[PDB]
């Protein structure tokens, strides 16, 4: 996250860290039920040196705060049994950039480990709304990752404005969130983490999946996020959740 601040310990108890074996933190994800995580499809693509699509190559850490303290009380480690990438995921365009990760054994709910709420298919996160992005990704473009989970406040951007800012690259599955002036944005290694939106009784709903941006926190290059309401039925059908 660029232009953010340290999270308080346990402030985002749905935020999960995905480690590929021998590589440390690669992507974020969100806990949505005892057994299920939401993340970005683009995190799970094989390349010629590593089968990022293979569930056995991954460790999920729940209730994590500090990358250097993965064994702290309240931290839960879990393997994955299955990765489902959206069937319509387009690796060129990052259309449909969403995956569901099945935990090998259920999370244990605690004050540090708790699911985010999913929005109904008809819910619209409106333009202008303040929402939160979190993660252990780069804290500058061309920078290094955070040891301590970072939070930043960003704002939903009008879709037409979004499409005009990034011509030929924005589909209806994507949402711009952040500021035309830059300054606060998600970044490399935040990918697949949730946007957290404070809703009417103060409960947090997931408003997006961190997907891509042109660099990070540049002027006129807001962060691009996979929308959640559009996949409520897809999540239901694949997970039971």
């Amino acid at each position: 996250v660029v232009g953010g601040t340290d999270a308080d310990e346990g402030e985002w108890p749905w935020q999960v860290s995905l480690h590929a074996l021998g590589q440390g933190h690669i992507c974020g994800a969100s806990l949505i039920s005892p057994n299920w995580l939401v993340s970005a499809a683009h995190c799970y693509i094989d390349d010629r040196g590593f089968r990022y699509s293979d569930p056995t190559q991954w460790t999920a850490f729940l209730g994590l705060h500090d990358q250097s303290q993965r064994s702290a009380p309240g931290v839960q480690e879990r393997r994955l049994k299955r990765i489902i990438s959206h069937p319509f995921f387009n690796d060129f365009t990052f259309d449909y950039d969403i995956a569901l990760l099945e935990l090998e054994k259920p999370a244990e709910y605690s004050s540090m480990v708790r699911p985010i709420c999913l929005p109904d298919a008809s819910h619209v996160f409106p333009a202008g709304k303040a929402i939160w992005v979190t993660g252990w990704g780069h804290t500058q473009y061309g920078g290094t990752g955070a040891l301590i989970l970072q939070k930043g406040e960003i704002r939903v951007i009008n879709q037409t404005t979004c499409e005009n800012l990034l011509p030929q690259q924005i589909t209806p599955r994507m949402m711009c969130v952040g500021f035309l002036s830059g300054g606060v944005d998600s970044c490399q290694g935040d990918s697949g983490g949730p946007l957290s939106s404070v809703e009417a009784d103060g409960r947090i709903f997931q408003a997006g999946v961190v997907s891509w941006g042109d660099g990070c926190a540049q002027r006129n290059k807001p962060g691009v996020y996979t929308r959640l309401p559009l996949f409520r039925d897809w999540i239901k059908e694949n997970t039971g959740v």
């Binding site: 004050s111 708790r114 985010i116 709420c117 103060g202 409960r203 947090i204």
Partner: peptide, 4 residues
């Protein structure tokens, strides 16, 4: 869901 959604609280601390």
């Amino acid at each position: 869901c959604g609280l601390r």
